[PDB]
Design an enzyme around this catalytic site. Structure first.
Site, PDB file in Angstrom:
ATOM      1  CG  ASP A 188      -7.850   3.062   5.481  1.00 31.24           C
ATOM      2  OD1 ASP A 188      -8.088   3.446   6.655  1.00 31.24           O
ATOM      3  OD2 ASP A 188      -8.663   2.264   4.934  1.00 31.24           O
ATOM      4  NE  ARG A 248      -0.238   9.636   1.874  1.00 30.10           N
ATOM      5  CZ  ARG A 248      -1.135   8.989   1.128  1.00 30.10           C
ATOM      6  NH1 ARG A 248      -0.791   7.936   0.387  1.00 30.10           N
ATOM      7  NH2 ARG A 248      -2.405   9.381   1.148  1.00 30.10           N
ATOM      8  CG  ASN A 305      -2.286  -2.024   4.188  1.00 26.90           C
ATOM      9  OD1 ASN A 305      -2.842  -2.321   5.261  1.00 26.90           O
ATOM     10  ND2 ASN A 305      -2.691  -1.010   3.422  1.00 26.90           N
ATOM     11  CD  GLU A 306       0.070  -3.826   0.126  1.00 28.50           C
ATOM     12  OE1 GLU A 306      -1.087  -4.060   0.526  1.00 28.50           O
ATOM     13  OE2 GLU A 306       0.515  -2.680  -0.111  1.00 28.50           O
ATOM     14  CB  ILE A 348      -3.714  -4.965   8.748  1.00 27.07           C
ATOM     15  CG1 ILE A 348      -3.846  -5.306  10.229  1.00 27.07           C
ATOM     16  CG2 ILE A 348      -4.113  -3.538   8.471  1.00 27.07           C
ATOM     17  CD1 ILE A 348      -5.252  -5.109  10.787  1.00 27.07           C
TER      18      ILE A 348
HETATM   19  N1  LIG Z   1      -5.152  -2.702  -7.000  1.00 22.68           N
HETATM   20  C1  LIG Z   1      -4.413  -2.028  -6.105  1.00 22.68           C
HETATM   21  N2  LIG Z   1      -3.162  -1.579  -6.473  1.00 22.68           N
HETATM   22  C2  LIG Z   1      -2.315  -0.988  -5.568  1.00 22.68           C
HETATM   23  N3  LIG Z   1      -2.733  -0.828  -4.261  1.00 22.68           N
HETATM   24  C3  LIG Z   1      -3.951  -1.271  -3.877  1.00 22.68           C
HETATM   25  C4  LIG Z   1      -4.823  -1.881  -4.779  1.00 22.68           C
HETATM   26  N4  LIG Z   1      -5.952  -2.203  -4.098  1.00 22.68           N
HETATM   27  C5  LIG Z   1      -5.809  -1.789  -2.818  1.00 22.68           C
HETATM   28  N5  LIG Z   1      -4.576  -1.211  -2.673  1.00 22.68           N
HETATM   29  C6  LIG Z   1      -4.002  -0.681  -1.412  1.00 22.68           C
HETATM   30  O1  LIG Z   1      -3.717   0.700  -1.462  1.00 22.68           O
HETATM   31  C7  LIG Z   1      -2.726   0.947  -0.479  1.00 22.68           C
HETATM   32  C8  LIG Z   1      -2.114   2.331  -0.676  1.00 22.68           C
HETATM   33  O2  LIG Z   1      -3.107   3.278  -0.281  1.00 22.68           O
HETATM   34  P1  LIG Z   1      -3.082   4.767  -0.882  1.00 22.68           P
HETATM   35  O3  LIG Z   1      -4.164   5.556  -0.155  1.00 22.68           O
HETATM   36  O4  LIG Z   1      -1.711   5.281  -0.845  1.00 22.68           O
HETATM   37  O5  LIG Z   1      -3.471   4.503  -2.412  1.00 22.68           O
HETATM   38  P2  LIG Z   1      -4.488   5.437  -3.220  1.00 22.68           P
HETATM   39  O6  LIG Z   1      -5.687   5.768  -2.415  1.00 22.68           O
HETATM   40  O7  LIG Z   1      -4.872   4.645  -4.493  1.00 22.68           O
HETATM   41  O8  LIG Z   1      -3.529   6.618  -3.675  1.00 22.68           O
HETATM   42  P3  LIG Z   1      -3.469   8.081  -3.024  1.00 22.68           P
HETATM   43  O9  LIG Z   1      -4.007   8.012  -1.639  1.00 22.68           O
HETATM   44  O10 LIG Z   1      -1.994   8.503  -3.032  1.00 22.68           O
HETATM   45  O11 LIG Z   1      -4.328   9.035  -3.878  1.00 22.68           O
HETATM   46  C9  LIG Z   1      -1.760  -0.234  -0.607  1.00 22.68           C
HETATM   47  O12 LIG Z   1      -1.085  -0.475   0.616  1.00 22.68           O
HETATM   48  C10 LIG Z   1      -2.694  -1.368  -1.029  1.00 22.68           C
HETATM   49  O13 LIG Z   1      -2.914  -2.273   0.029  1.00 22.68           O
HETATM   50 MG   LIG Z   2      -5.509   6.843  -0.569  1.00 26.49          MG
END
Ligand SMILES: Nc1ncnc2c1ncn2[C@@H]1O[C@H](COP(=O)(O)OP(=O)(O)OP(=O)(O)O)[C@@H](O)[C@H]1O
Ligand SMILES: [Mg+2]
Ligand SMILES: Nc1ncnc2c1ncn2[C@@H]1O[C@H](COP(=O)(O)OP(=O)(O)OP(=O)(O)O)[C@@H](O)[C@H]1O
Ligand SMILES: Nc1ncnc2c1ncn2[C@@H]1O[C@H](COP(=O)(O)OP(=O)(O)OP(=O)(O)O)[C@@H](O)[C@H]1O
Ligand SMILES: Nc1ncnc2c1ncn2[C@@H]1O[C@H](COP(=O)(O)OP(=O)(O)OP(=O)(O)O)[C@@H](O)[C@H]1O
Ligand SMILES: [Mg+2]
Ligand SMILES: [Mg+2]
Ligand SMILES: [Mg+2]
Lengths: 249, 249, 249, 249
Positions: free
Chosen positions: B49, B54, B115-116, B153
């Protein structure tokens, strides 16, 4: 016009009857809710929210309700006994109303609910196994004390106590939430009120708005009805929500 | 047609490209998203996701996105690497899309979030004092690690982690919820996405979709934008929601 | 005897100095805490709970602390500015004390915490993957904003905000709880304070009592230290807990 | 020795009896719990945790219990039917036991509870007003479906479902928690098991471990009893806790 005044307690009733007489409204008094309330142009409820729920249980077609809050929190009411006359004058003279959807349940064909339909164990301290279906697909199965299907208006009632979100009154939806779920993870689900909800359980009771109940076994279906609750317009309903919720106790 | 394939890791890319070539679609490969993606007929994302978030960060006008899930949960994806060809063919041939609203924030012009928008303390392990206004009325003030304004979402993202309800993807709303609130009582609020949200805090940062951040002080406004996220229709989106949520971890 | 008076605000200090002189106690005034506080027979803190935490950060051996509450709730204080003289006299004449354990952390050897050690993401709004071991056994792994290891005194602090239980101050234990966990199910764990806690995380920061922090990667160990926080006995500590907790916000 | 084998289902009983015979233990079979079980050297329970709770209800002086889990999670059991002979041999030969406190309540003298005493509404979907006192001081008043006073062993039972913390089996305490509280803020309270608990409610029922129940009105006292539940030592009880909890459903 003719109005019905429904009161749980005898306090403030002569005063309300007098104010209505100044507005040239004929008054009939009711110490208990009655299906005869359908024959009136509007209804003044004196009490809290439960008085309003008990009134609604007698109405299919719903004359607009004006609530004077002598109860606890008063999310469904319009005014306090200390200053109701102006707001009542506004309501009768403008006659602007709002409608909120009520739901029906297959186990109790002639019963409508504004807040929620709850499926509970017949025996306190014993769990039931509940399965939940939305638009024909099983979305969860959980052991719990019970399970709530609430409208957005019910989001501040039983669903709130079970851990649900506060949803604004103008966003139509169901809140689906278990009471004391015996499971590591669970979440409330918020879905469109256009969807059909089925709750499947054995050895259960179904309760509408905390007022009317019946044993069932197997399946019940819950859906939006054609007969909404009708209130005079409360221009402060959204604004007042947040403060009222914080005072819930 | 011309499609862009955007990948976090290079695995599965050659086979997805060959599959598109068989659908008579010209392909360009991207190892990172760019604003150039607006020039394509559709986009295939290979990743979780976050890869999709991104991609969206670079898109104002959004060509329909098809997601192939190599990540954890994949609430925004359509297929897995093991069996994507049939679903990809269906997607291209029918070309039915769904649009999900994105929001904008006054502190970050030209940035959109699916998302937010989250407002957090600039200093880790230090609370900020956050005031929340909805349609111009102050509805809460709370000390907390941060505060989330999510779409439906986003109900399964940061808002989920903070204790929010799961909201179905086809019910448009905001979920307003604090992260680690220092208060005896608090609730998530679910409101219409037609409403204007203001968050007021000093010494904070604002973050869109966990991807882009800026320091701010004072007030930020968050509102629905005219530029939704566009996906190929996933006919199983509602059905899949419940199983996917249970697998979150 | 000699007492240190530590104050965050300048206001009530002259009054407290005169009260101590009437009790034949020499006074030294401090606007900021320092290590010199160890050289006093007791300490009078004028502030809220944070002022007490900042005093403790400078103390290995801890002279008994008497707190005069000018902050919000004041779980660690003994009296208010409006009436402190009688309680201060009783405290000094009786000299009865209570000791509450503090914990140490392997990442910050000379640092002690009364409330909690918190492990947080070094990057705002990004999760860390945290593993938790207790007495050598891995009990959980979770993606979260951070993770709190609190004492029972800390149960009304960061752990409270993260959704933890209120634990009475005389039941010695650790509360283990994630901040914003991205998982369908999670629970706070309450374990004996005789057990060794290990938290494992990359790209994190560790914070003691919201005051002192360092970056770390890998494993940290948290255990009960030999240097407790020392307060004058508050006979009403248990009784006052419930009202104070309800006032948090 | 003589052992009693108590079985909810008749499946593995012949296997277990033959195994005890190999250890030169005289066996007597019980289709259901009896006070006669007090007259044995040890008890083997065949079933889940509920079977163990029902055995305990018939026991004041408790011979050590060995649980063979045919149930679901089996927090109180020592082995599965697939591999019980080795663990049973160790139990009989070492004869090391563990004692966990049980509580009594004034409404049902002679009834003991290992998990919890719950005070519930007599009528489903109807709230009761509950006041809670701990060591003589009123610490809360709340409208709720009911209220749970659990031991640490009960922290994974009804209290868990009500949103309580998981507490390790070797930290003696009470967990005080409401079921579906109608209030904006509430918290579970964890207190010393040396304290006296009083629950005050009208139109209620009190239930011990989900088994024995009685109507009451007014006040009940709950305190630690002198008659603990006795089990053979489970060396992996703490280690197994975390995995078993995650599988609760
Ligand atoms: N506790 C949390 N803190 C921050 N983001 C969260 C949390 N729980 C769920 N999210 C979600 O993660 C989304 C970002 O997804 P992303 O895939 O970039 O994060 P990641 O999987 O933790 O990091 P990365 O993919 O860069 O390794 C945010 O839009 C948010 O909705
Ligand atoms: Mg991720
Ligand atoms: N914990 C709860 N248990 C049952 N109902 C609850 C609970 N919390 C909130 N409610 C709400 O209470 C509503 C019924 O209100 P009602 O006024 O009838 O009950 P009451 O105030 O408890 O007492 P009474 O029925 O005697 O007036 C239900 O529709 C439900 O939404
Ligand atoms: N959401 C939260 N985030 C961080 N700390 C919290 C939170 N909730 C409670 N706390 C408690 O606050 C304690 C620190 O208190 P402190 O007085 O330093 O913070 P503050 O009052 O927010 O800031 P300051 O006193 O510097 O104005 C921590 O030990 C922690 O237990
Ligand atoms: N939501 C809940 N409601 C009631 N009891 C619960 C709940 N969740 C967990 N429990 C625990 O269940 C225990 C009773 O176990 P028991 O095996 O008797 O119930 P059961 O599994 O539902 O089976 P049965 O009712 O047929 O005996 C209680 O002591 C309580 O701790
Ligand atoms: Mg009522
Ligand atoms: Mg402070
Ligand atoms: Mg059972």
């Amino acid at each position: 016009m003719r109005a019905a005044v429904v009161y749980k307690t005898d306090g403030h009733v002569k005063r309300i009857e007098e104010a209505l007489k100044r507005l040239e409204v004929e008054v009939e008094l009711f110490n208990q809710p009655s299906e005869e309330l359908e024959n009136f142009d509007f209804i003044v409820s004196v009490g809290g929210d439960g008085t309003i729920l008990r009134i609604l249980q007698k109405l299919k077609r719903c004359p607009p309700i004006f609530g004077i809050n002598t109860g606890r929190v008063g999310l469904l009411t319009h005014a306090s006994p200390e200053n109701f006359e102006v707001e009542l004058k506004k309501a009768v003279e403008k006659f602007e109303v709002e409608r909120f959807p009520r739901v029906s349940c297959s186990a109790m064909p002639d019963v409508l609910a504004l807040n929620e339909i709850a499926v509970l164990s017949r025996k306190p301290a014993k769990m039931i196994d509940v399965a939940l279906r939305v638009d024909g697909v099983e979305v969860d199965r959980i052991r719990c004390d019970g399970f709530i299907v609430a409208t957005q208006i019910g989001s501040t009632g039983y669903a709130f106590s079970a851990g649900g979100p506060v949803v604004e009154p103008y966003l139509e939806c169901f809140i689906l939430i278990p009471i004391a779920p015996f499971r590591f993870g669970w979440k409330p689900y918020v879905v469109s009120m256009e969807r059909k909800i089925e709750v499947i359980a054995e050895k259960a009771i179904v309760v509408a708005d905390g007022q009317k109940s019946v044993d069932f076994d197997g399946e019940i279906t819950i859906e939006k009805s054609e007969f909404p609750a009708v209130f005079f317009k409360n221009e402060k309903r959204f604004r007042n929500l947040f403060g009222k919720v914080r005072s819930i106790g």
